[PDB]
């Protein structure tokens, strides 16, 4: 252990396991062993001192870093095998306290208990306040949400890419988000969510959206679809080439207009396209020349964003056409609350139709109250509460799990100083009649995510369409 | 003690195979053993 902590002859990833009851000492130096760093504890005291923290604060222009902690023997990597022999204190503030005396031989301490979470799970606020299946479901929703997938999304020509117009950093963040770069590349918008049974259109996990907010760009996004095509001379009898088919060039052509294509057979950027339009004009010589143009789908409606021409790995003429389609939130689009409450937009009500507070604030999204009791997503309620204080206090709330400094009572106390009901409730007025609602509605800023599942991407219809000539049965046209 | 119930028991009733997961009997007593734990 001493040599490992000093890194003299044993590297930090080597694990030494002694089976005291079995007179066995196993030293594992092989690859693929999962391990994690744990602070070393000696004589019920942490080896980490303020001097190390000060040197870690002065990280810049000083070159002091994590490697200096390992070399100092303050922290070491413990693997799943060695953990059996390790007596791990959850926190130095209470687990190694002589007053508790639960164990007097702690060997290590957790740096922060929240580091057991993954990437998607670290995006959940107050996960310790949510039911475990909802944290699992959010981990999937976080991967299906919309935001900015990468900074160079304008240069990249990915086959499918959804970029949110106005992504925002969450008003209630988890400390891990600073390391996940969720602040620089957010995937959602802080929405004023009201939990109310407003005319029943939000029933059964449905959501009601403010049409005036959507008109202002709320959750608006741009969908980029990249189409790739190349011309290959494989087989001397066939020679495909990009060029717009012409009556004299091709023996047979449809009445569809090819005027969108340029003399090079490629559509130009800034041109509107639909299932009736051709993005690439390709023709192959027959063993006259037939046309093998690339048409868009009937659902594809957008504008040509960029068209590149290059020579691919095969050396053949290759081109990629990126079509831009703007997806405005509409009935049926799926949304997620960052706490596993996934739901489709049921209806959109304008600002005058939505219920309003005494200050004239109308919720951006209204969710059904029955979604919370069965799911027990109290972390959502606490996030909605912490977000209301955050927006008023002008500070990004910290929702890191297992943190004793933040609790519902402290959040309620702060909210009381901003002139709001300590539990987040507000007296809402019905937008249709102006009468106060008898029950006070829980409303506040909650981080919502738009999922890639748009209704326009799934709606389809079939009525006497193309059939297979051999099987005489339905097939996609 | 545990007994097979639910979907796997319903599966055994439709899949009547020679070896069930929890073959068992429900034995009833006639005389004093019905009312006396010692005789039972």
């Amino acid at each position: 252990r001493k040599l490992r902590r000093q890194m003299d002859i044993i590297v930090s990833e080597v694990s030494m396991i002694r089976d005291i009851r079995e007179r066995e000492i196993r030293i594992y130096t092989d690859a693929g062993r999962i391990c994690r760093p744990l602070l070393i504890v000696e004589k019920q005291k942490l080896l980490l001192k303020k001097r190390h923290i000060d040197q870690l604060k002065e990280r810049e222009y000083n070159n002091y870093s994590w490697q200096d902690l390992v070399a100092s023997g303050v922290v070491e990597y413990i693997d799943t095998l060695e953990e059996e022999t390790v007596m791990l204190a959850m926190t130095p503030d209470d687990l190694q306290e002589k007053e508790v005396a639960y164990c007097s031989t702690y060997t290590h301490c957790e740096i922060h208990p929240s580091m057991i979470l993954g990437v998607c799970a670290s995006i959940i606020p107050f996960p310790d306040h949510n039911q475990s299946p909802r944290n699992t479901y959010q981990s999937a929703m976080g991967k299906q949400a919309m935001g900015v997938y990468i900074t160079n999304f304008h240069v990249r020509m990915d086959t499918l890419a959804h970029v949110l117009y106005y992504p925002q950093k969450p008003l209630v963040t988890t400390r891990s988000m600073e390391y996940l770069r969720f602040r620089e590349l957010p995937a959602g918008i802080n929405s004023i969510v009201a939990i109310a049974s407003y005319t029943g259109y939000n029933q059964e996990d449905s959501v009601i959206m403010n049409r005036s907010a959507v008109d202002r760009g709320f959750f608006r996004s741009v969908f980029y679809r990249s189409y790739k095509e190349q011309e290959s001379k494989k087989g001397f009898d066939q020679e495909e080439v990009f060029e717009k088919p012409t009556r004299e060039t091709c023996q047979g052509m449809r009445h569809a207009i090819y005027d969108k294509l340029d003399d090079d057979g490629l559509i130009a950027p800034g041109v509107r396209v639909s299932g009736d339009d051709v993005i690439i004009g390709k023709t192959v010589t027959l063993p006259t020349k037939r046309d093998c143009s690339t048409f868009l789908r009937t659902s594809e409606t957008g504008i040509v964003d960029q068209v590149m021409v290059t020579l691919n790995q095969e050396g053949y003429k290759f081109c990629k056409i990126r079509v831009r389609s703007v997806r405005i939130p509409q009935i049926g689009d799926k949304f997620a609350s960052r706490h596993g409450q996934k739901g489709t937009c049921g209806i959109q009500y304008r600002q005058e139709d939505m219920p309003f507070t005494c200050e004239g604030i109308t919720p951006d999204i209204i969710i059904n109250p029955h979604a919370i009791p069965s799911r027990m997503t109290i972390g959502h309620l606490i996030e909605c509460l912490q977000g209301k204080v955050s927006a008023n206090k002008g500070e990004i709330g910290d929702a890191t799990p297992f943190n004793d400094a933040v609790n519902v009572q402290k959040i309620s106390n702060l909210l009381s100083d901003y002139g709001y009901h300590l539990r987040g409730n507000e007296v809402l007025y019905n937008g249709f009649t102006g009468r106060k609602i008898t029950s006070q509605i829980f409303i506040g800023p909650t981080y919502y995510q738009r999922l890639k599942h748009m209704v326009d991407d799934k709606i389809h219809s079939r009525a006497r369409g193309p059939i297979q000539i051999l099987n005489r049965q339905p097939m996609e046209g | 003690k545990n007994v097979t119930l639910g979907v796997p028991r319903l599966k055994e009733l439709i899949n009547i195979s020679k070896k069930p997961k929890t073959p068992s009997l429900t034995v009833f007593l006639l005389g004093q053993s019905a009312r006396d734990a010692e005789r039972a």
């Binding site: 041109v271 021409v309 290059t310 | -």
Partner: protein, 44 residues
């Protein structure tokens, strides 16, 4: 038929027969110039 070199962003005219290679930079990634047609966007 004008293409923009992806590296030097210089407008060059290219035919069907000549290669995609940039006239001066030699870069082989070219982007078609935006259409001259009028495209109307409703501010909604």
């Amino acid at each position: 038929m004008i293409y923009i070199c992806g590296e030097c962003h210089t407008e060059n005219e290219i035919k069907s027969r000549d290669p995609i290679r940039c006239r001066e930079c030699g870069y082989r990634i070219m982007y078609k110039k935006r259409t001259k047609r009028l495209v109307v966007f409703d501010a909604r």
